[PDB]
Amino acid sequence: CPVSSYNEWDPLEEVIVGRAENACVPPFTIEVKANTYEKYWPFYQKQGGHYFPKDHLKKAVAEIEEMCNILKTEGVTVRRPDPIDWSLKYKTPDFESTGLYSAMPRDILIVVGNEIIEAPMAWRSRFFEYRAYRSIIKDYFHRGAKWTTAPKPTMADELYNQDYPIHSVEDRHKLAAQGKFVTTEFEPCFDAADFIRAGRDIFAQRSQVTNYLGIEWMRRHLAPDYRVHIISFKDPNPMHIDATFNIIGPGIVLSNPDRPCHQIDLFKKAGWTIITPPTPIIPDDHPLWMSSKWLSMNVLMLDEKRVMVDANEVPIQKMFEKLGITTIKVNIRNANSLGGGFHCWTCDVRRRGTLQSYLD
Amino acid sequence: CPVSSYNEWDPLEEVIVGRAENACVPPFTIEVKANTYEKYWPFYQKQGGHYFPKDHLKKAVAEIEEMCNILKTEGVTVRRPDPIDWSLKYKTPDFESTGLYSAMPRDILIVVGNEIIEAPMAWRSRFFEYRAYRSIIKDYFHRGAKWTTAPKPTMADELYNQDYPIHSVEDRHKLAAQGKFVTTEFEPCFDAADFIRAGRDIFAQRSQVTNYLGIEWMRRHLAPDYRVHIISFKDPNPMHIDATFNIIGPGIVLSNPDRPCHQIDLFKKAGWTIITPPTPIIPDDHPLWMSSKWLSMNVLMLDEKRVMVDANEVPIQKMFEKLGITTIKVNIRNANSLGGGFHCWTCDVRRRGTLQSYLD
């Protein structure tokens, strides 16, 4: 079976790497505003519907092609989504929108065992993102893999809190602590990147794009073989868990010092090593349209002792080296601007290993 | 669990009944042409995109409301889809179209055990048909049911044989015998009504709307608990199996005399009683925009000894009575025009009984 991955660290054999081509700035709607820093709100307001800066995209394209060359050198088979113009305006009976990109396979695809799952998504500009990946998925399906598409939401107004009182990220953090997010519990929705795998146990967070119904759908669909746990953090990342709590080995996890886990004691009791990475050194003047500087810890493990890490982030490279983990440095400074690091730009399709429990 | 149905005959407790409101004539595209009699091709050519005759719809509405009253009298809980204007024109990145209706729950939903499955569909005018049923499905999901949506096709040109050489139904029957259908094997597609359930065994046919990839997806998704078998017939119904091979009890099936099953011997060997119903008496001048006169055998079983049958079709009523099966006669002559009989207009959500094998 070409598809087989139970965790984030077993020896990597095949991976899907996103594309930066034709990425479009999403219209500035309520859910986009709730998942981005205010510094960029006017950019979205103005550039909405247009391509991200083409000079910047060209650099990202170059960085990602090099990343793929390195992956191939490290013995990994690389598949890429189909090139698509994301500027096309589509219209469902519930809304109309232009697209985003197919830069982050981690946001839409998650592999659990021999099954590839397409997440529903929660942004109107990402409704048809799955189209870029169908050629690959059908190929794996023809080769024996299980293929699942979680229920696609209508993304009607009822799914969003149109009047979400966010005027700054600080407001968002407070609302979030109150259990208030831009997405309601109207219908299931989730981004696959809000889930992180550790064999029989999968961890998820309720975020601005992943609601409890979405998590419950995953929990119910995967039981009894897998257990989906809900964890939460202080001042959480609006969307996606991999730059907050990145599991890098059996019983080893990188925990973002700025977003501590409320359930950290569950992990300590299981005898897990919680590593807090050093701060990112990325320039504050560098544009990060989505996500934050913590992309430095959004690493991808080639195996337990080999990590693909940002070439510029020396301090975290040192941390890994002191732990006896070989650093494969790759520069994706411009690709970072699109909202992701190594874990985000990929979806591990096949890792060599079996299903096991690490929480004991 | 509100959802629990393993076959077509156990004591019925809850059912979804379609709506005739706002039904629109689908644009006359290649897949519509391949699933309709030539007599009506000019109607589709002219009325495409407009509402079906409103005077006719009004009569169908009345007939269906009465059917629901009767179901309630027979102790069955009835749920109905949400009223929606099907004339809305939508646009995906692959095509643009107006909708059809939510008259036939059997075409889009199938219940296997405690799981409700939304079929992908194969017609561009039925891409967003699932929207009418989400309120119901979310309610069952909240109440514990498993919910699955098979992979939604792009329905791009590649899925269809644009030059399907059909000039008459006779041509279609020949092509079909050659294994040539309007849909290719480009991506999975299927209508749930091409499947019929008998406990651990589910039977399906490759039709103009259900391809082998679609059947394989179902087979792979349901294994190992259920076995999906592929059967075929002479001069088959272009879409849907329930007016061709309608299983009405443990080891009892109605087999359309005009469309004999190529694998009938498998059933004889299992000791199944194959009943061939008498011919339909419906007037040839009555408009049947979709399907055929064989809607008479498209019965719905309330239990092994109670069948909901067309009030006008006396000959088949007699056949059931001689078999000791109580006939609940309901007139849906005008609703028939939309393309379905009792089995088509409903989706059995809950029947009282357990999972069993009848093929031995």
UniProtKB/Swiss-Prot annotation, chains A, B:
Changing Y140S: In CCDS3; loss of glycine amidinotransferase activity. Induction: Expression is elevated in the myocardium during heart failure, and decreased in inter-uterine growth restriction (IUGR)-associated placenta. One of its GO terms (cellular component) is extracellular exosome. Belongs to the amidinotransferase family. Expressed in brain, heart, kidney, liver, lung, salivary gland and skeletal muscle tissue, with the highest expression in kidney. Biallelically expressed in placenta and fetal tissues. Changing A122P: In CCDS3; decreases glycine amidinotransferase activity. Changing E170K: Complete loss of activity. Its EC number is 2.1.4.1. Homodimer. There is an equilibrium between the monomeric and dimeric forms, shifted towards the side of the monomer. The keyword Cytoplasm applies. This is Glycine amidinotransferase, mitochondrial. It is linked to Cerebral creatine deficiency syndrome 3: An autosomal recessive disorder characterized by developmental delay/regression, intellectual disability, severe disturbance of expressive and cognitive speech, and severe depletion of creatine/phosphocreatine in the brain. Most patients develop a myopathy characterized by muscle weakness and atrophy later in life. Fanconi renotubular syndrome 1: A form of Fanconi renotubular syndrome, a disease due to a generalized dysfunction of the proximal kidney tubule resulting in decreased solute and water reabsorption. Patients have polydipsia and polyuria with phosphaturia, glycosuria and aminoaciduria. They may develop hypophosphatemic rickets or osteomalacia, acidosis and a tendency toward dehydration. Some eventually develop renal insufficiency. FRTS1 inheritance is autosomal dominant.
